[PDB]
Amino acid sequence: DIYDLEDLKKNLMTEGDMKIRKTDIPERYQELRAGITDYGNMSSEDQELERNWIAEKISVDKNFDANYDLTEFKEAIGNAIKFITKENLEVPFIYAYRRNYISSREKDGFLLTEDDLWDIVSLDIEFHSLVNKKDYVQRFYAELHIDDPIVTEYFKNQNSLQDIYDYLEFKYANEINEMSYEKFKASPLYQAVSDIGISAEDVGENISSQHQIHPPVDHPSSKPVEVIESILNANSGDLQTKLAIDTVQKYYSLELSKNTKIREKVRSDFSKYYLADVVLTAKGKKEIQKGSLYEDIKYAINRTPMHFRRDPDVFLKMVEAESLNLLSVKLHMSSQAQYIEHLFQIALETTNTSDIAIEWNNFRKLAFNQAMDKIFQDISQEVKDNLTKNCQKLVAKTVRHKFMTKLDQAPFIPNVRDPKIPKILSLTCGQGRFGADAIIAVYVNRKGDFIRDYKIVDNPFDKTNPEKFEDTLDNIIQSCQPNAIGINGPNPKTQKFYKRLQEVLHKKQIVDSRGHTIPIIYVEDEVAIRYQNSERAAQEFPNKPPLVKYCIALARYMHSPLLEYANLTSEEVRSLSIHPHQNLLSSEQLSWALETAFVDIVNLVSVEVNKATDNNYYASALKYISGFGKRKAIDFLQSLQRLNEPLLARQQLITHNILHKTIFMNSAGFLYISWNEDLEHDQLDSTRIHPEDYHLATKVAADALEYDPDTIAEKEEQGTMSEFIELLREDPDRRAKLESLNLESYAEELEKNTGLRKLNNLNTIVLELLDGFEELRNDFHPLQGDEIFQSLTGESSKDPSIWDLKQELEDAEEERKLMMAEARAK
């Protein structure tokens, strides 16, 4: 039994996983919404607030002129939210096939980038979580039925939420416990709290009002101590000495610290005008030394929300170092003692001059400070937590862009004028003990297949017989005829190897048809290093040595950087040196930065269905296709394998009951079928044109060729519009006629007659009809001189107002004195 559910978990066949496989919503969306009760049942007012709240957040980084009218921008934000939340479409799809519904009608107004679209997904979830918490609290109070003026005012006017809940928890503890302070409140001693002359609530409204609308009422005949003693004497039985006074003052403090109006005031000021200081421990005092990367924050003081908006990494440094108990990041307000005194003046302070008024003002003043100490301690932690998260988000963005630049590398092409995926000969000289360490070379063909490897034993720099190596290389290059050569290695001997290889190429005149020496490039080997020592490489090539697995990986990286990253395991991909700060992210944030980047580029590049069904390397991209995740990618390949025949058209995904409406809409344009029974093959299945735009596509072809409306209406009635694609395909004048459609006018007329906004759609329709699935990644990046160096080598503010010079000096003097003491110890 227990072993049955292990194999289910392994195969992704648990009940929970079967629901995910079956449900017609993108897998990632199902994962994201898993913790959200009633995801689809938000009120109208809430949906409205979510659009404005989100719209504002994205608006930030756009830097829109103060004059700028934000109305069309907010409508784009609304549209994206419709697509994500109501139509369950993913970012790649929205960006590919709805760009004009998230862009400004007017040229270069605004565009919601893919970055924006991912933020909107994340913020959407997060807004639904709030609404969840808000509905939980508001349903918890409406359930109580009690009519507390504070909370009723609250849900009308509206971390305030947590405070409201706590105020109900504190005040009505007994009344809800059906559905310590509470028992003191029943005690006779609580009379003394009444005698203080102003309720916690009144203080709260004083502070909210900014003036003392509720003046305290001093006890007429008695001081605090007397009132207490009168209450003790009149209750010999129950109560059993200044401790009593302390208690009254403690529980009154407590009532003050639970007031939402007081906590709200402090929260807003503290969160706007905080400063961060570093407080060291001995461990941090000696460890930095000037060598660690903290030479500009070892005595960091008075850091502002602006300082951390600009350099958000800085704080995370602080939080990790504190989790190392090397230091502790302290947040505080500019003039905290004075900020509190001021609030006391406005809220509690009396100018009555009698002894009785004096002792009561002192008593209230103490209770108020005790309460403000608690509030500040809480708010200090909230602002810290939210600053951490806020900085983790800024870093997540850059980690995602860095990883995307790695992924956004087109297959290396040796001759840009005649783009052809090259036959590859990749080499490594390993340790580089020339004449002792064999040189390893591998030959991988255009389709990505490994053909064979070589083991050159001729010493490249043989003094007596140099020509031996030259000739062997010539032989290999005549047998394989590569179009490009890729290399890399552990040390600078790899460089000498490269220089040499250039000489041998020119001497033997190994060239292109164009007479240019075949290009040699250094190849990023961060994947190759992890592959050569992997179970899957040992499994894929059971009886080859490390450096052969390493060279196969070099070639494969040249062919598709994307597929190389996409074929690492979670463990292997997370261990890459992607960004120096990536370890400051939570595993969940890191996973999201990587996954969104995968999804962006995997859908840009697409996946040929047939080639994935029976090739696991290539099928590794499937899980990142719009609509798919890890469970749907499997279920889908299994559906295809059961089919025992190749897929002939996109539409078969639905006729065969492989995909339903939604996952089909999400994915169909990113899943293609290569073009070259007869009536069963659609040519548009080899383009980035989506099935829903097929009718538009054939119309573009018909107009390109200048066909009559009688002829078009005729085919339109017949149901043979598809015939126009072949007609454009036969026609030899097709490129010039396509290129001559004025696409702006065409989108104008189209919208005018149908209301559809399809300009961007029409653009990639004409480009895809010219040449299906042209390559759209940015260029392959051969390692440049600097990176070569680092690869083979390993080598790569003290202003008194923001820097604690005094502490630095005193710590330096105590350290020196420390060294003197350590010396003496002999």
DSSP 46-115: HHHHHHHHHHHHHHHHH---SS---HHHHHHHHHHHHHHHTS---HHHHHHH-GGGSB-SSTTS-B--HH
| Strands of the 424-428 sheet, one edge to the other | 450-456, 439-444, 424-428, 484-487, 520-522
Decide which of 1.10.3500.10, 1.20.1250.20, 3.20.20.120, 2.60.120.640 is the CATH code for 180-416+561-605+797-826: 1.10.3500.10
Residue 452 β-bridge partners: 443
Phi-psi region of 790 (alpha: psi -120 to 50; beta: other; left: phi over 0): alpha
Crossing angle of helices 71-85/114-144, nearest 10°? 80
CATH annotation of 36-179: 1.10.10.650
CA distance from start to end of the chain? 68
Residue 258: closest CA among 381, 384, 378, 134: 378
Angle at alpha carbon of residue 817, lines to 814 and 819, rounded to 5°: 110
Euclidean distance between CA atoms 713 and 56, whole angstroms: 47
What sign does the dihedral 259-262-268-272 (CA atoms) show? negative
Euclidean distance between CA atoms 75 and 77, whole angstroms: 5
- 582: which 2 tokens? 């990536």
**Residue 652 identity (one-letter amino acid):** Q
Alpha-carbon dihedral angle through residues 382, 384, 386, 387, given to the nearest 10 degrees? 160
Judge if 36-179 and 677-776 fold alike in CATH terms. yes
Q: What is the phi/psi pair of residue 12, to 5°?
A: 65, 60
Euclidean distance between CA atoms 672 and 690, whole angstroms: 10
Euclidean distance between CA atoms 97 and 749, whole angstroms: 19
DSSP state of 651: T
> Could you identify the residue written with the tokens 């050159």?
456
> Are the beta carbons of 703 and 741 closer than 8 angstroms?
yes
CATH superfamily, with its number, for domain 677-776: Spt6, Death-like domain (1.10.10.2740)
Max intra-chain CA distance, the chain: 116
**Residue 33 identity (one-letter amino acid):** R
Euclidean distance between CA atoms 394 and 665, whole angstroms: 32
> Are the beta carbons of 102 and 81 closer than 8 angstroms?
no
Euclidean distance between CA atoms 601 and 561, whole angstroms: 11
DSSP state of 279: E
DSSP state of 42: -
- How are the residues of the chain apportioned to helix, strand and coil, as percentages rounded to the nearest 5? 60, 5, 35
- 58: which 2 tokens? 């994205």
Which residues, other chains included, contact 43 with Cβ-Cβ below 8 Å and sequence gap of 6+?
none
Domain edges within the chain: 1-35+606-676, 36-179, 180-416+561-605+797-826, 417-560+777-796, 677-776
- Residue 738 CA, chain-centre distance (Å), reads 40
CATH annotation of 417-560+777-796: 3.30.420.140
Residue 544: closest CA among 429, 438, 442: 442
Helix (H) or strand (E) holding 444: strand 439-444
* 3-class secondary structure per residue, 129-149: HHHHHHHHHHHHHHHHCCCCH
Extract long-range pairs of 704-713: CB within 8 Å, 24+ residues apart. Answer: 704/728, 704/734, 704/737, 704/738, 704/740, 704/741, 705/731, 705/737, 706/737
Euclidean distance between CA atoms 589 and 568, whole angstroms: 19
Fold designation for 1-35+606-676: DNA polymerase; domain 1 (1.10.150)
Q: Is 44 helix (H, G, I), strand (E, B) or coil?
A: helix
Q: What is the phi/psi pair of residue 166, to 5°?
A: -65, -35
**Residue 638 identity (one-letter amino acid):** Q
What sign does the dihedral 55-57-60-62 (CA atoms) show? negative
Euclidean distance between CA atoms 313 and 391, whole angstroms: 7
Residue 70: closest CA among 87, 86, 57, 85: 57
Angle at alpha carbon of residue 57, lines to 393 and 65, rounded to 5°: 125
> What is the C-alpha R_g of the chain?
36
DSSP state of 684: G
Q: Give Cα separations from 364 to 171, 216, 341, 355 (angstroms).
A: 21, 10, 12, 14
Euclidean distance between CA atoms 667 and 146, whole angstroms: 52
Residue 301: closest CA among 818, 774, 798: 798
Euclidean distance between CA atoms 403 and 398, whole angstroms: 8
Euclidean distance between CA atoms 429 and 488, whole angstroms: 8
- Residue 590 CA, chain-centre distance (Å), reads 7
Which residues, other chains included, contact 617 with Cβ-Cβ below 8 Å and sequence gap of 6+?
563, 567
Q: Give Cα separations from 800 to 299, 309, 771, 797, 804 (angstroms).
A: 10, 21, 63, 9, 6
Buried b (16+ CB within 10 A) or exposed e, 291-302: eeebeebbbbbb
Task: Count the residues in the chain.
Answer: 826
Angle at alpha carbon of residue 323, lines to 318 and 326, rounded to 5°: 70
Residue 23: closest CA among 615, 776, 635: 635
Which residues, other chains included, contact 641 with Cβ-Cβ below 8 Å and sequence gap of 6+?
613, 614
Experimental technique used to determine this entry: X-ray
Q: Is 703 helix (H, G, I), strand (E, B) or coil?
A: helix
Angle at alpha carbon of residue 503, lines to 500 and 508, rounded to 5°: 130
Breaks (C-N over 2.5 A) in the chain follow: 158, 179, 240, 676, 796
Buried b (16+ CB within 10 A) or exposed e, 707-732: beeeebeebeeeeebbebbebbeeee
Which residues, other chains included, contact 484 with Cβ-Cβ below 8 Å and sequence gap of 6+?
412, 414, 422, 423, 424, 425, 518, 519, 520, 521, 558
> Could you identify the residue written with the tokens 């720099």?
461
DSSP state of 33: T
Helix (H) or strand (E) holding 574: helix 570-574
The pairing of beta strand 450-456 with beta strand 424-428:
unpaired
Euclidean distance between CA atoms 613 and 610, whole angstroms: 5
The pairing of beta strand 484-487 with beta strand 450-456:
unpaired
Q: Is 511 helix (H, G, I), strand (E, B) or coil?
A: strand
